[PDB]
Design a protein around this nucleic acid. Structure first.
Ligand code: MG
Ligand code: MG
Ligand code: MG
Ligand code: MG
Ligand code: MG
Ligand code: MG
Ligand code: MG
Ligand code: MG
Ligand code: MG
Ligand code: MG
Ligand code: MG
Ligand code: MG
Ligand code: MG
Ligand code: MG
Ligand code: MG
Ligand code: MG
Ligand code: MG
Ligand code: MG
Ligand code: MG
Ligand code: MG
Ligand code: MG
Ligand code: MG
Ligand code: MG
Ligand code: MG
Ligand code: MG
Ligand code: MG
Ligand code: MG
Ligand code: MG
Ligand code: MG
Ligand code: MG
Ligand code: MG
Ligand code: MG
Ligand code: MG
Ligand code: MG
Ligand code: MG
Ligand code: MG
Ligand code: MG
Ligand code: MG
Ligand code: MG
Ligand code: MG
Ligand code: MG
Ligand code: MG
Ligand code: MG
Ligand code: MG
Ligand code: MG
Ligand code: MG
Ligand code: MG
Ligand code: MG
Ligand code: MG
Ligand code: MG
Ligand code: MG
Ligand code: MG
Ligand code: ZN
Lengths: 100, 147, 127, 114, 224, 99, 82, 211
RNA sequence: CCGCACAAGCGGUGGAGCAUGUGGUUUAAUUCGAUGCAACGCGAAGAACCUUACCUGGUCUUGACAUCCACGGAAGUUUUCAGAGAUGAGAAUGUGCCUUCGGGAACCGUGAGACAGGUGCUGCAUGGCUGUCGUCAGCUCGUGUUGUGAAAUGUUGGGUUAAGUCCCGCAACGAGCGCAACCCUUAUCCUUUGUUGCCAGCGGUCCGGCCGGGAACUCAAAGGAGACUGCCAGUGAUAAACUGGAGGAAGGUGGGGAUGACGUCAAGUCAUCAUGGCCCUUACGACCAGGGCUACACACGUGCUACAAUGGCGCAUACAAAGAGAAGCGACCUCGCGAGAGCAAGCGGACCUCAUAAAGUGCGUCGUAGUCCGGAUUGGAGUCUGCAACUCGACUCCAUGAAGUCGGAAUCGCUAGUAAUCGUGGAUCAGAAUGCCACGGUGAAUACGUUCCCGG
């Protein structure tokens, strides 16, 4: 897709990478029963102030090859089109035409 | 079967009586592959048939069959430029099949607060020539001569 | 002595051990009619043994894995057939013509792409 | 019988009979029955007045019939007066829980009009 | 071959007077029972003079093609060719055998490849069905080119039985200039045969006489 | 005590050669090797739309079959463990040693 | 509903703006894009201009509105029939 | 109709893969992604070395690429200075100790990648596509192949409409799986667009499976 | 002369509710593409934000993304205020590495131009990829012969086959691409290896293959064997083949895949990508928040659940296969009516977890009714994912209990483990399946035939 899209995905990944511990501990506080319910409150307030793109769920798996948002295969990290080209050429090890 | 017509799976006989015609009957009554449900109703109906209508349940089977099994039907074929209602006489297997179909459909058209009672009463009326299956043998013999 | 046979149906497998001496049948540490709730299954497992007429002459210790009640019953029948064949060669000639050494190869056919089942095709619309 | 719900449950099993009260389903029916120590399969016939009075005493423990209808109507009417989204979809007779209106909203829209 | 030697075999026999060809009048003795009778007075010297040419060709290392497609006489002609180390056609004459020899060369190569391959191996590598199919192809190729697998090039002389039946072969030969030696019944057209032998072509006895005499003279021509 | 070694690969020729080499190195060093025991292969399927646009019925089905072998040595000596430690195998095979 | 263990959710900038307004007397309708904030009981008697996608429509909060989200009072789809 | 890729369908039967490492789902994606980056880099640098193929293996720790080209001198140069720079850039492009390797293809007229690349390079010169593919077929056949087929497509000779056309000679059984059919494509970026060339080369049937 | 094309059958669709796609209209925008078969659960293997391309508003101008140039700084880290956020304004800390000591790398910011950028237009400029006729049986060439020649023959005919399959005839013989086979899988057997799989004979048991042990058997997965009209009889030019029979686990290409010739449709895709030309280049590029893609008088297509006693409900209880798992699958135990929660073992997995299959079967109940059928809709109260469930999530509980009583004309699928029914799993995926792709369980009916319908 457009280069700006790949750039957005790179920025989202890099950003969610550096705030992981902060998000994890804030979530731990919020979900923790036995929190003083003042701690949980300022915890949720503090959590919603982090950069929105620091959320792992904001990311969208795109083809490492072309950046295509749909038809993704987590195993290969490529869209459905590029995996076929790579497989017919013999780049994906062990992959072959299945028939049973 | 444009090249060669192929025959039918010779089905395996009834486990309770070793007869193959009751096997075809339970296959006809079966719905959605529920064979156990089917054979349960068939055995229940033949048992009470052996009581409310004299003995010989396996014989009362054909007592109803020969009472419903048709001889002539119509096979509309356009050998003259238009579908002509020409009558044709059947082999034994054709009339067997039509008999069992007509039995089961009439049984399903009864209610009788059970399918066991449905099939039982319908097969009794068929054996002694009462009901609707016998009537649809009457009509298949009637329209076979109408043209 | 001991006589076994391996029977198979669509997806079941049955090990059958024949021991002369009685007419008991044990399936997976259970009795026949207490293992199989359907009557046609009991009939089909007694099928070969009653054909060769030697029912109360030899008891059966049989295990079975996989498949459903009908597949398990058919696999048991095939195993009993092969076990009897080992016990007496003469029985095999009648067993074959009864259709017991058939080992039917029929099995569930795979689901194909673009169809809803093995052969059921989606409901096309002309108009 | 003349249960708290002024309607008359039929002469079927006690649970299926009590389900006829508006606001009493099968779960709450068997809850009523078990709490009154009355059996499950018994019908409202052969049920003594001493037992029907316990049934009434225990069904009065809930909010049923007109009182429940008034509360549901008040909640919808109040919800309509707020001017909230579901209030508008109630006023416009369109599905409020976010279903398709592009097609088959027939339970809310009624039969078809060309 | 002496006139008496032919006559006992029945060389004088011919086709019906209903079925004859116009150019054969000089070679016809007459008619009996509506049957054409061939004249041995012409037959014997012409056959001898043809044997002279065949001996000459074989004595200059000639390759000889015996030709006959009669279902009765196929094996006779094949054995006749084998008795003198020569080449033969004993089944349907393939149009283009001489004119299109090059395509036959590919067929001869395929026949050689199949027979060599089975001895060499690779049949085990093939599935049993595939190996059996290859054997069937080899058998079909042998039934088609058993006689001419070792001919190597175009033959130097042709011997033809019932020249009318094998007319394509003689047309090819004339187109190539290859000489034609042929037993010519009364119903045949003798224009295509440069050394023409008028005689019966069906009777097994006379056919075998022709073949045996030719083969004896061919071995004689080879021996020197 | 035991040393249990698992080998995963994508083709069975290579992994069988690897097992043979492993067991022969273990035989040189006087060990007792349970001959390679075949464990169930894992077929990963992937169905993928071949057409770039419009056609969803036209697909293609691929499969990675992970072949897996288990070798086990029960009487190991130092000259056993070091031998398979000085052992380099084909690139396609993954070895996993456990004690 | 989100959950009771977490308690209701309000966007922090609405918290700040609302306490500013309630502490400093009446204001003009405060402008907000936070359709996802929960209406709180201190947030009563105020008027809030919630953006419906294209324009901040003013909603005058009342007591029985507490608990609902602001976006429930700013319809985002214009429709009048066919 | 559309034909199946004549190399993918023979994978495992007669054709080997071009990447033979093993990985798990954890490191499977990024592994072949670094693999792809390696391939593209090598094909960019060796654009004049007539590189036919680039195989990658990954042993325990390192990675090892093998370059099949017909110009081993060009990738070797002098005492392997160029291949050493290649080793450096490959090792840093994969984050792993590299090991480059070369294996000369001896008949550059019998491998589908090189004949297709030659055809495309000729089509850059605006040579007649007809005689280009005809020379390709003639050379490949004369060198000893059993069959060959070439197919060019798309605005041939600067024309205004796309005229796909092909030329084959010999024997190319595309439905036989034994057949070792070397297939490869190439693109030629002309002034009038892209001209796609496909090449199939049949070099006899293989008997006895993969080995 | 062929094909589920009809016929013979079985189950549907068309009627009802809901799911989903399209058209239409509406809208601020309802992003763009796909349009007879061969578009319409299609691209999309999964739109709350993100995605996202669309809209409203707020914003940037060598730029979000790349190379080069100077100038200044280590890079980072943490924290405050204003803002809806983009962003601005700062305040703290650190000021590092290699060095041939000059700097250099590493990045960061500012500046200037080359340029970046475009899911902008044209699939009638293209590559690549795909559909379709159609897995239909065809399409050709060489050489030969015939004709002055364009050409024809081969490839027509008689038989036969799933087949241009094969035989016979025949101036043709041959071949090539197709067909068939080689490949995968399934059905039988044998060999080798036997843990995490197995338990026949053994002893021991807490009765659990659990434990000594055993390598037999089921399995696992690598090698091989096996089916060829090979055998028999009969038809047929004796041939090809066809009909039956034997043996055999399997019989006549055993079943099912994959495999799609020459070409047709200026078929589809410039929005995967690549790409000629053109168009924008403080904007048709870039960033952000909110909204939309989910609208609804309607129309069509594809599905789901139903209308019930072959069934509903309650209790009891039996038999699978194939899969997935490390920001993962998550047992046992306690808590909750439940969705779930707490604690936390094991498992990169024939070991552990998802995960108890459902139909079935036994027993009881309901008695043909808008019902103990059906579950739509709506009110109330929750759980979980997630910055965030208003628009617009899934699920749970309590209550509510529409239409619907088997569907007009018309029309669809299917020839055997098939149809029909019953559950299970996977991909995508934080969450979000009635779709798709797979998996097993139960398991039919009918085929006189080729007159017609469609297509070839
Ligand atoms: Mg781009
Ligand atoms: Mg996502
Ligand atoms: Mg309820
Ligand atoms: Mg929805
Ligand atoms: Mg697994
Ligand atoms: Mg149809
Ligand atoms: Mg029909
Ligand atoms: Mg409908
Ligand atoms: Mg659209
Ligand atoms: Mg579909
Ligand atoms: Mg979709
Ligand atoms: Mg703007
Ligand atoms: Mg702020
Ligand atoms: Mg600047
Ligand atoms: Mg540009
Ligand atoms: Mg086009
Ligand atoms: Mg075919
Ligand atoms: Mg013909
Ligand atoms: Mg052919
Ligand atoms: Mg012919
Ligand atoms: Mg085995
Ligand atoms: Mg042990
Ligand atoms: Mg063994
Ligand atoms: Mg095998
Ligand atoms: Mg037999
Ligand atoms: Mg037979
Ligand atoms: Mg075969
Ligand atoms: Mg087959
Ligand atoms: Mg094929
Ligand atoms: Mg294809
Ligand atoms: Mg077009
Ligand atoms: Mg189209
Ligand atoms: Mg813009
Ligand atoms: Mg946005
Ligand atoms: Mg949509
Ligand atoms: Mg109900
Ligand atoms: Mg139960
Ligand atoms: Mg999953
Ligand atoms: Mg509990
Ligand atoms: Mg839990
Ligand atoms: Mg599950
Ligand atoms: Mg149920
Ligand atoms: Mg039940
Ligand atoms: Mg009701
Ligand atoms: Mg009604
Ligand atoms: Mg009713
Ligand atoms: Mg068919
Ligand atoms: Mg299903
Ligand atoms: Mg998900
Ligand atoms: Mg499911
Ligand atoms: Mg199924
Ligand atoms: Mg027609
Ligand atoms: Zn003659």
């Amino acid at each position: 897709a457009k280069q700006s899209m790949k750039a957005r995905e790179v920025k989202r990944v890099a950003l969610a990478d550096k705030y992981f511990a902060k998000r994890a501990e804030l979530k731990a506080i919020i979900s923790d029963v036995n929190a003083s319910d003042e701690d949980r409150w300022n915890a949720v307030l503090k959590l919603q102030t982090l950069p929105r793109d620091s959320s792992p769920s904001r990311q969208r798996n795109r083809c490492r090859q072309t950046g295509r948002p749909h038809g993704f295969l987590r195993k290969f990290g490529l869209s459905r089109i590029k995996v076929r080209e790579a497989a017919m050429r013999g780049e994906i090890p062990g992959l072959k035409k299945a028939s049973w | 079967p444009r090249r060669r017509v192929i025959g039918q799976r010779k089905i395996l006989p009834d486990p309770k009586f070793g007869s193959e015609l009751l096997a075809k009957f339970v296959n006809i009554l079966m719905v959605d592959g529920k064979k156990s449900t089917a054979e349960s109703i068939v055995y229940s109906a033949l048992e009470t048939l052996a009581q409310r209508s004299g003995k010989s349940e396996l014989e009362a089977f054909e007592v109803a069959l020969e009472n419903v099994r048709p001889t002539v039907e119509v096979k509309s074929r356009r050998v003259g430029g238009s579908t002509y209602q020409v009558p044709v006489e059947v082999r034994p297997v054709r009339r067997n099949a039509l008999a069992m179909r007509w039995i089961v459909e009439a049984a399903r058209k009864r209610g009788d607060k059970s399918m066991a009672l449905r099939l039982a009463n319908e097969l009794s009326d068929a054996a002694e020539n009462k009901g609707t299956a016998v009537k649809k043998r009457e009509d298949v013999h009637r329209m076979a001569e109408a043209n | 002595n001991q006589y076994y046979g391996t029977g198979r149906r669509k997806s079941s497998a049955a090990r059958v051990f024949i021991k002369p001496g009685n007419g008991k049948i044990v399936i997976n540490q259970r009795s026949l009619e207490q293992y199989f709730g359907r009557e046609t299954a009991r009939m089909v497992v007694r099928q070969p043994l009653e054909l060769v007429d030697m029912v109360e002459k030899l008891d059966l210790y049989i295990t079975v894995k996989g498949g459903g009640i009908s597949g398990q019953a058919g696999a048991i029948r095939h195993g009993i057939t092969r076990a009897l064949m080992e016990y007496d060669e003469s029985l095999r000639s009648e067993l074959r013509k009864a259709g017991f050494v058939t080992r039917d190869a029929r099995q569930v056919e795979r689901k194909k792409v673009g169809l809803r089942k093995a052969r059921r095709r989606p409901q096309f619309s002309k108009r | 019988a003349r249960i708290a719900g002024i309607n008359i449950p039929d002469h079927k099993h006690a649970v299926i009979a009590l389900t006829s009260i508006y606001g009493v389903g099968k779960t709450r029916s068997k809850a009523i029955l078990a709490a009154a120590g009355i059996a499950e399969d018994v019908k409202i016939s052969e049920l003594s007045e001493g037992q029907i009075d316990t049934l009434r005493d225990e069904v009065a423990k809930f909010v049923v019939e007109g009182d429940l209808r008034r509360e549901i109507s008040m909640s919808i009417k109040r919800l309509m007066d707020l001017g909230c989204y579901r209030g508008l979809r109630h006023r416009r007779g369109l599905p409020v829980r976010g279903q398709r209106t592009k097609t088959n909203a027939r339970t809310r829209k009624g039969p078809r009009k060309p | 071959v002496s006139m008496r030697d032919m006559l006992k075999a029945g060389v004088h026999f011919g086709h019906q007077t209903r079925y004859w060809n116009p150019k054969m009048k000089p070679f016809i003795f007459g008619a009996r029972n509506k049957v054409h009778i061939i004249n041995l007075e012409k037959t014997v010297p012409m056959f001898n003079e043809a044997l002279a040419e065949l001996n000459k060709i074989a004595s200059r290392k000639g390759k000889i093609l015996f030709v006959g497609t009669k279902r009765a006489a196929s094996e006779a002609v094949k054995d006749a060719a084998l008795s003198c180390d020569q080449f033969f056609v004993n089944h349907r004459w393939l149009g283009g055998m001489l004119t299109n020899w090059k395509t036959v060369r590919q067929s001869i190569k395929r026949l050689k490849d199949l027979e060599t391959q089975s001895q060499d191996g690779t049949f085990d590598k093939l599935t049993k069905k595939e190996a059996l199919m290859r054997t069937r192809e080899l058998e079909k190729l042998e039934n088609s080119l058993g006689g001419i697998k070792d001919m190597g090039g175009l033959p130097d002389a042709l011997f033809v039985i019932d020249a009318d039946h094998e007319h394509i072969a003689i047309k090819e030969a004339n187109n190539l200039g290859i000489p034609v030696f042929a037993i010519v019944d009364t119903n045949s057209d003798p224009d295509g045969v440069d050394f023409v032998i008028p005689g019966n072509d069906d009777a097994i006895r006379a056919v075998t006489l022709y073949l045996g005499a030719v083969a004896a003279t061919v071995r004689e021509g080879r021996s020197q | 005590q035991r040393i249990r070694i698992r080998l995963k690969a994508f083709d069975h020729r290579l992994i069988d050669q690897a097992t043979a080499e492993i067991v022969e190195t273990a035989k040189r060093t006087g060990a007792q090797v349970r001959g390679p025991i075949p464990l169930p292969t894992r077929k990963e399927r992937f169905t993928v739309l071949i057409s770039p646009h419009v056609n969803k019925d036209a697909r293609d089905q691929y499969e990675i079959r992970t072949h897996l072998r288990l070798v086990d040595i029960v009487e190991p000596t130092e000259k056993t463990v070091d031998a398979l430690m000085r052992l380099d195998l084909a690139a396609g095979v993954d070895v996993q040693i456990s004690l | 509903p989100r959950s009771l263990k977490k308690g209701p959710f309000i966007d922090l900038h609405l918290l700040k703006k609302v306490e500013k307004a309630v502490e400093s007397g009446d204001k003009k309708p405060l402008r907000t894009w936070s359709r996802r904030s929960t209406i709180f009981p201190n947030m009563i008697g105020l008027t809030i201009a919630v953006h419906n996608g294209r324009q901040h429509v003013p909603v005058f909060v009342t007591d029985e509105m507490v608990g609902h989200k602001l976006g429930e009072f700013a319809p985002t789809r214009t429709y009048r029939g066919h | 109709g559309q034909k199946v890729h004549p190399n993918g369908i023979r994978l495992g039967i007669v054709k080997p893969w071009n990447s033979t490492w093993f990985a798990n789902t954890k490191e499977f994606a990024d592994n072949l992604d670094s693999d792809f980056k390696v391939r593209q880099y090598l094909t960019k640098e060796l654009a004049k070395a007539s590189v036919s193929r680039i195989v990658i293996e990954r042993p325990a720790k390192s990675i090892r690429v093998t370059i099949h080209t017909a110009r081993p001198g060009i990738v070797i140069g002098k005492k392997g200075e160029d291949v050493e720079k290649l080793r450096k850039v490959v090792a840093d492009i994969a984050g792993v100790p590299a090991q480059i390797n070369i294996a000369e293809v001896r008949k550059p007229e019998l491998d589908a990648k090189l004949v297709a690349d030659s055809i495309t390079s000729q089509l850059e010169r605006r040579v007649m596509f007809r005689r280009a593919m005809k020379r390709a077929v003639q050379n490949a056949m004369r060198l000893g192949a059993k069959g060959i087929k070439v197919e060019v497509s798309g605005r041939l000779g600067g024309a205004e409409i796309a005229r796909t056309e092909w030329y084959r000679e010999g024997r190319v059984p595309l439905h036989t799986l034994r057949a070792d059919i070397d297939y490869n494509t190439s693109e030629a970026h002309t002034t009038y667009g892209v001209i796609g060339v496909k090449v199939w080369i049949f070099k006899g049937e293989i008997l006895g499976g993969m080995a």
